[PDB]
Design a binder for this molecule. Structure first.
Ligand SMILES: Nc1ncnc2c1ncn2[C@@H]1O[C@H](CSCC[C@H](N)C(=O)O)[C@@H](O)[C@H]1O
Length: 245
DNA sequence: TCTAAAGATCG
DNA sequence: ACGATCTTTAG
């Protein structure tokens, strides 16, 4: 089980075996909500189409892919004991928000991810990262994970776009795995959750397999009515919806 | 999920 | 300018 180099909310590392058991085979895997890319890192497709609405995330992945050695060397310098301080953190956060250099932002993004509060990724409406200091004992610099990501990324294209556009990229030899933001138990809207299912239905009718993961609720069972539903026991369970052609 | 402070929105 | 109520911000 390969780990992502990023902390990311809604990561699927603990559920990978269940996903891989129901994920269909194909030439290309399409992930409209790639996030930290835990599925991408733990599958074996010949090609990947990876997308996310987060532009900082997609830019970071491109930098790591194309400028691997350069990035690792620069990012490693921020993972020293000197930087594990509140005053230093908030200046690096300010430098990130004020930088117009994709490389420097990518370097700082990793620092903020592993030194920031609970590994959160939060912005304001002005597009500024505003997660406070995390106060960890000793943040781990994911060098091994970075190089492995770069290696696997050689067979992947990255796109910053919404799910509707990325799922439109899927062709006959594609398999689509969707890991949308969790459905509410009591921003990704309810309409977007439903629209995702409608796009999935359209895809499978063109003989393109789609696998969606979400919480197991009354709403998600309704949204994914036209799919074979598998319950994953994990109090709420996890749901896997497979649209098989 | 928390919240005090600042800004948004409408009549 | 006012008042009530969200909305946003960010530790
Ligand atoms: N409208 C949208 N279109 C495409 N991606 C979106 C989106 N709204 C949210 N997202 C992205 O979907 C991701 C869901 S978290 C899923 C993470 C991933 N499965 C992993 O293993 O790491 C988030 O990173 C978020 O940035």
């Amino acid at each position: 089980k390969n780990r992502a180099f990023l902390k990311w909310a809604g990561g699927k590392y603990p559920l990978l075996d269940d996903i891989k058991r129901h994920l269909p085979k194909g030439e290309c895997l399409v992930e409209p909500f790639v996030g930290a890319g835990s599925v991408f890192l733990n599958t074996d497709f010949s090609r990947y189409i990876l997308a996310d609405i987060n532009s900082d995330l997609i830019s970071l992945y491109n930098i790591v892919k194309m400028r691997t050695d350069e990035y690792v060397q620069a990012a490693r310098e921020l993972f020293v004991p000197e930087t594990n301080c509140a005053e230093v953190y908030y200046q690096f956060r300010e430098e990130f928000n004020k930088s117009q250099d994709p490389f420097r932002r990518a370097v700082l993004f990793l620092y903020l991810n592993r030194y920031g509060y609970n590994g959160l990724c939060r912005y304001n409406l002005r597009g500024e990262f505003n997660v406070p200091f995390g106060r960890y004992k000793k943040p781990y610099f994911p060098e091994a994970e970075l190089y492995h990501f770069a290696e696997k990324a050689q067979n992947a294209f990255f796109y910053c776009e919404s799910y509707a556009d990325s799922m439109a990229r899927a062709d006959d030899s594609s398999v689509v795995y969707c890991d949308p933001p969790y459905a509410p138990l009591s921003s990704f809207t309810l309409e977007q959750q439903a629209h995702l299912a409608e796009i999935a239905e359209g895809l499978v009718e063109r003989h393109i397999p789609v696998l969606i993961s979400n919480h197991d609720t009354m709403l998600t069972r309704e949204w994914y009515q036209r799919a074979k539903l598998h319950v994953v026991k994990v109090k709420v369970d996890e749901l896997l919806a497979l649209y098989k052609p």
